[PDB]
Design an enzyme around this catalytic site. Sequence first.
Site, PDB file in Angstrom:
ATOM      1  N   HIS A 123      25.129  -1.672  -4.207  1.00 24.35           N
ATOM      2  CA  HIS A 123      24.657  -1.431  -2.847  1.00 24.35           C
ATOM      3  C   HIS A 123      25.399  -2.296  -1.826  1.00 24.35           C
ATOM      4  O   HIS A 123      25.689  -1.816  -0.724  1.00 24.35           O
ATOM      5  CB  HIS A 123      23.144  -1.689  -2.766  1.00 24.35           C
ATOM      6  N   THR A 178       0.820  -1.204   0.000  1.00 23.10           N
ATOM      7  CA  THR A 178       0.000   0.000   0.000  1.00 23.10           C
ATOM      8  C   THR A 178       0.854   1.254   0.000  1.00 23.10           C
ATOM      9  O   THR A 178       0.358   2.341   0.310  1.00 23.10           O
ATOM     10  CB  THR A 178      -0.946   0.064   1.187  1.00 23.10           C
TER      11      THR A 178
HETATM   12  N1  LIG Z   1       5.618  -8.931   5.422  1.00 25.58           N
HETATM   13  C1  LIG Z   1       5.020  -7.757   4.762  1.00 25.58           C
HETATM   14  N2  LIG Z   1       3.697  -8.069   4.719  1.00 25.58           N
HETATM   15  C2  LIG Z   1       2.804  -7.188   4.154  1.00 25.58           C
HETATM   16  N3  LIG Z   1       3.241  -6.003   3.639  1.00 25.58           N
HETATM   17  C3  LIG Z   1       4.580  -5.677   3.672  1.00 25.58           C
HETATM   18  C4  LIG Z   1       5.455  -6.535   4.226  1.00 25.58           C
HETATM   19  N4  LIG Z   1       6.703  -5.978   4.133  1.00 25.58           N
HETATM   20  C5  LIG Z   1       6.621  -4.767   3.528  1.00 25.58           C
HETATM   21  N5  LIG Z   1       5.314  -4.577   3.251  1.00 25.58           N
HETATM   22  C6  LIG Z   1       4.443  -3.506   2.612  1.00 25.58           C
HETATM   23  O1  LIG Z   1       4.871  -3.283   1.141  1.00 25.58           O
HETATM   24  C7  LIG Z   1       4.338  -1.856   0.831  1.00 25.58           C
HETATM   25  C8  LIG Z   1       5.386  -1.108  -0.017  1.00 25.58           C
HETATM   26  O2  LIG Z   1       6.539  -0.751   0.748  1.00 25.58           O
HETATM   27  P1  LIG Z   1       6.981   0.822   1.060  1.00 25.58           P
HETATM   28  O3  LIG Z   1       7.891   0.748   2.213  1.00 25.58           O
HETATM   29  O4  LIG Z   1       5.803   1.774   1.459  1.00 25.58           O
HETATM   30  O5  LIG Z   1       7.816   1.477  -0.242  1.00 25.58           O
HETATM   31  P2  LIG Z   1       7.427   1.446  -1.815  1.00 25.58           P
HETATM   32  O6  LIG Z   1       5.997   1.763  -1.987  1.00 25.58           O
HETATM   33  O7  LIG Z   1       8.260   2.507  -2.551  1.00 25.58           O
HETATM   34  O8  LIG Z   1       7.808  -0.102  -2.355  1.00 25.58           O
HETATM   35  C9  LIG Z   1       8.095  -0.387  -3.769  1.00 25.58           C
HETATM   36  C10 LIG Z   1       9.377  -1.209  -3.993  1.00 25.58           C
HETATM   37  O9  LIG Z   1      10.599  -0.350  -4.603  1.00 25.58           O
HETATM   38  C11 LIG Z   1      11.669  -1.060  -4.273  1.00 25.58           C
HETATM   39  C12 LIG Z   1      11.334  -1.779  -2.936  1.00 25.58           C
HETATM   40  O10 LIG Z   1      11.746  -3.085  -2.917  1.00 25.58           O
HETATM   41  C13 LIG Z   1       9.798  -1.567  -2.805  1.00 25.58           C
HETATM   42  O11 LIG Z   1       8.995  -2.777  -2.397  1.00 25.58           O
HETATM   43  C14 LIG Z   1       4.141  -1.284   1.954  1.00 25.58           C
HETATM   44  O12 LIG Z   1       2.731  -1.022   2.145  1.00 25.58           O
HETATM   45  C15 LIG Z   1       4.672  -2.336   3.102  1.00 25.58           C
HETATM   46  O13 LIG Z   1       3.936  -2.072   4.352  1.00 25.58           O
HETATM   47  P3  LIG Z   1       4.202  -0.679   5.315  1.00 25.58           P
HETATM   48  O14 LIG Z   1       3.289  -0.856   6.473  1.00 25.58           O
HETATM   49  O15 LIG Z   1       3.848   0.620   4.578  1.00 25.58           O
HETATM   50  O16 LIG Z   1       5.665  -0.617   5.741  1.00 25.58           O
END
Ligand SMILES: Nc1ncnc2c1ncn2[C@@H]1O[C@H](COP(=O)(O)OP(=O)(O)OC[C@H]2OC[C@H](O)[C@@H]2O)[C@@H](O)[C@H]1OP(=O)(O)O
EC number: 1.5.1.52
Lengths: 428, 428
Positions: B215, B9
């Site tokens: 990285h 999200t």
């Molecule tokens: N175990 C687990 N279960 C459910 N949801 C999880 C989990 N781990 C991470 N997340 C969620 O993935 C979403 C995308 O990550 P985000 O940190 O907001 O950054 P981005 O939107 O920019 O991500 C895009 C990609 O670019 C590269 C990087 O690998 C990113 O995934 C975010 O809503 C996370 O939840 P949260 O509650 O908001 O922390």
Amino acid sequence: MSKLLMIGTGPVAIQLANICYLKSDYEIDMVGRASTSEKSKRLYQAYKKEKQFEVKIQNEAHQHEGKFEINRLYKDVKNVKGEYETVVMACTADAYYDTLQQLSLETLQSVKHVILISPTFGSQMIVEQFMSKFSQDIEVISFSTYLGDTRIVDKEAPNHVLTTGVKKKLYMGSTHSNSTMCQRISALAEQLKIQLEVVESPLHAETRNSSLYVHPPLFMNDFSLKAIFEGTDVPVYVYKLFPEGPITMTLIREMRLMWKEMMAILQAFRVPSVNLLQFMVKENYPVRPETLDEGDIEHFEILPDILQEYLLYVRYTAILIDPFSQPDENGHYFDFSAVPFKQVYKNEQDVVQIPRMPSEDYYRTAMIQHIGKMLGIKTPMIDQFLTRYEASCQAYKDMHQDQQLSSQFNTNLFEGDKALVTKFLEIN
Amino acid sequence: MSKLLMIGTGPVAIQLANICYLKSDYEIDMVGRASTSEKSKRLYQAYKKEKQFEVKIQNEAHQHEGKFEINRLYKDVKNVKGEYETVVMACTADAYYDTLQQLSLETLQSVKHVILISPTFGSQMIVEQFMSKFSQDIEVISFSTYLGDTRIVDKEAPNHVLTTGVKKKLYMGSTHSNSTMCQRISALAEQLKIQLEVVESPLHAETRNSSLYVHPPLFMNDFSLKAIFEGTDVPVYVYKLFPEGPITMTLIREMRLMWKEMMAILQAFRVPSVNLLQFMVKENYPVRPETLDEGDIEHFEILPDILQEYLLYVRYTAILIDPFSQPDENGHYFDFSAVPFKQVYKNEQDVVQIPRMPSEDYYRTAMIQHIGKMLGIKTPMIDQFLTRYEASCQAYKDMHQDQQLSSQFNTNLFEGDKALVTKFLEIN
Ligand SMILES: Nc1ncnc2c1ncn2[C@@H]1O[C@H](COP(=O)(O)OP(=O)(O)OC[C@H]2OC[C@H](O)[C@@H]2O)[C@@H](O)[C@H]1OP(=O)(O)O
Ligand SMILES: Nc1ncnc2c1ncn2[C@@H]1O[C@H](COP(=O)(O)OP(=O)(O)OC[C@H]2OC[C@H](O)[C@@H]2O)[C@@H](O)[C@H]1OP(=O)(O)O
């Protein structure tokens, strides 16, 4: 009693005159060119009025300070009269011949020691060959460089100079191994707390100057040469990386290539070679341990030709800042590398001058070229350096026909000097 | 009709949800972890209240903008009910397994396509092997990276995101060559003006990400790791030269060595190799012509191991500034390289977190290690990277026994993922 002739009236000459005043039994005479140089006039008028020179000191670690009066301040080399057993050349190396040749036969035949403060490569060869016509047994002493840094802090009092810094190590050589003069100098160095490595010939001391290898690449390239003879749209800097300054893989290659051509000429003369990296790192300015492998700088000269380049390149990026300065609250260090280029400029009589850098590096390079020509040694990087500078001179002449230019824009300079190293090497 | 499940999200998920909203016939469901993450709660509460997401655009060159409403926003993966033919993983790669495994059997058996937005190396292998237990014929699509840069400009309105930049080129591969899904994506890319190189496997697209190679050296070294787990006395910077940041000849060696170990694993999989320099120079950010020889970056991979280092080192110094930015009146450019390190931090429930970098590079590296272990390929630089990070975790645990730490400080993480790539490679 013993007379000493000091040729030059700038801050180096004044510091040196004070050292002789305080620590020798020479009566000192000084000569500039107050007839044809507004600078030497200001010095003349100022000494005339005050009847004193003064060296002040910045770090209390130094006792070259002192006020002093010399015996006679001449206005032009041509006025010089009489006998002098010792003459110190405290002028720039490209004038050693122009100025000695203006001395009288009586003066030239009386001289026992010529001491060369800021010689280039082969200055001694030039000076010995010249003097040999008048002195049977002339002694010539070459230093690697001047002992430190001294400056005029106020142009309207150029008889008051300031020594800001003193080098770690100097080298010194003489036509006369372990002469009596050699011994007084290393004993005088001891009094001054200036480490002096006595070296076995003057030529050898003349190669222990790092700017001889790095000024020709830094300044005689299209970037630097544009910055000097034509403006830049935005301020540009000697020691920064392109586009802020000239340093590129290409410049660093040009520097290694000149270093190696020089090491050719040096092996010819059975002179030992200069580890350029280690020279820069222990005798110029240190970088952090983490930046250069200690075995890389010890074994610099064995290393492959692109590792050598890589280590030189890296050395220059370590110095973009002063890594031993105190960091900002923001992480930011002193901008050690934002040294601007001095550009071409009109003097007091409206005549265009070329600044010391690169016009002193044209002389040094033009001589190194000439030596290497007559050892049959090829100097292709040197060669390019010189055509670059000359094309920038010719272009300034064409672009600026409405202007008085100085003798530095001329073709065929140094015919005198070139012939003296020719006579010298044939005979020697 | 066709259902799509968006897992994540954050701003990437919202941008992607809008692209599906506008350019597909999928009804979209979205799921975060609003039960256990203050971030996902803020997103939930905000979408609840406004009933809209919004992508705004910064450069008018982009028409991903738009307000939109999805069909169902779930609060936790565990609430997910029903059948979805397509699931987009818009979360971080180290959570692909944790989150799929929480889905219901009915959901997992209905799925035809798993699309991996920010996969690491071997994510597809993990995801295909997992899904294979429930889907006979699962299709898995890996992208090289996310399409650009989008961010929340206000944390109290995380349902409003801003896409600031869009990459030049993306790569994309699928378990199903030139599938029907592959074709819609490259046709959707065409609508979006985003160049898409369709590649022949997902693994192959997963290696066309430059941060996978740079990285681990930048962040898993003693300098960087101190800056992250312990302070620095003075602000210190990711992309600067020592002592201002980590970059040294040693770091650059560590980067070439990892690059080459990776190229080993890639030749094993008969995947083509990545010209790391040329990749950085054409697909990341350009430097001036005068800085890198065009034949040096074309033939990068033939070049000797210290020339490769030298060119990488030089590339990083060209970027200390933005050489295409508009210079100061003083010559000075934009300080492109003063990117600070995010340090370890307590979350809203007072629990210490490790920032994305290096904790996402521990996952990627730990997986690359594991693959290379089971090809019998040695990964000695990778090996060192991981022991470094683990010792920094253990030291934080010892130094901070008074603190709640997160699961990231734990030993033996990713046992799930490690076993899936083991089953995958044996079977495949
Ligand atoms: N175990 C687990 N279960 C459910 N949801 C999880 C989990 N781990 C991470 N997340 C969620 O993935 C979403 C995308 O990550 P985000 O940190 O907001 O950054 P981005 O939107 O920019 O991500 C895009 C990609 O670019 C590269 C990087 O690998 C990113 O995934 C975010 O809503 C996370 O939840 P949260 O509650 O908001 O922390
Ligand atoms: N043809 C000629 N004839 C007579 N006199 C000449 C000639 N050319 C230069 N000079 C004079 O040498 C003196 C020292 O030079 P200066 O520029 O003041 O700087 P420094 O004091 O720092 O010099 C020390 C050395 O450090 C390295 C460099 O090579 C320096 O020579 C100075 O008085 C010059 O006169 P001017 O009238 O003042 O310009």
